[PDB]
Each structure stands twice: as C-alpha cells, then as structure tokens.
UniProtKB/Swiss-Prot annotation, chains A, C:
Changing residue 8 to D: In HPRI; Providence. It comes from the Eukaryota. This is Insulin B chain. Changing residue 20 to Q: In MODY10; reduces binding affinity to INSR; reduces biological activity; reduces folding properties.
Length: 27, 21, 27, 21
C-alpha cells in the first residue's frame, strides 16, 4: 500500500465507500 | 484518527472502510 | 459557481472544511 | 442532501460549509 494523505485520502474514501459516503475527521 | 492511521502510518482497505458511514 | 459532483464535491469539502473535516452522505 | 444541493443544483460556500463537522 501507500501512505494516503489529504486529498488522496479523501478520494480513496470516496471511491471505497461509494453510495454509503463517509466521515473525514482530522484530530 | 484516520490521518494517524492512513497518512502518518499505512492503512489497508479494512481500516479505510471503518470511516464509511 | 459550478455544479460540484463526485470527487470534485469531496475535494471542495476537503478544502473548505480544513481541520474540521466533513461528512459526505449521498442519499 | 449534499448531492441534491451541490451536484444536481448549484450550491454556494454557505451551503457547502453546512457539511463540515
């Protein structure tokens, strides 16, 4: 795998989660 | 958090999918 | 403005929300 | 939802920011 940061991490969540959507919470 | 698990560390699909709704 | 869909919408939320993060929930 | 307000329709920053945590 890769480190996934920032917009790449968001985009990965977008693709993987599909119609479910997701929560992105730094901190 | 997700940044810690996927950005600072490396995460797999299982962990990434934990953040789907 | 523009229509914002899919990865572009996610990316806009990423930029605007910053350290707060966001929830992306289709449906 | 956000898709309805920002993708099907057009949304401003105010509406987009409603989805920040």
């Amino acid at each position: 795998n890769q480190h996934l940061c920032g917009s790449h991490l968001v985009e990965a969540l977008y693709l993987v989660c599909g119609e479910r959507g997701f929560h992105y919470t730094p901190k | 958090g997700i940044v810690e698990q996927c950005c600072t560390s490396i995460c797999s699909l299982e962990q990434l999918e934990n953040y789907c709704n």
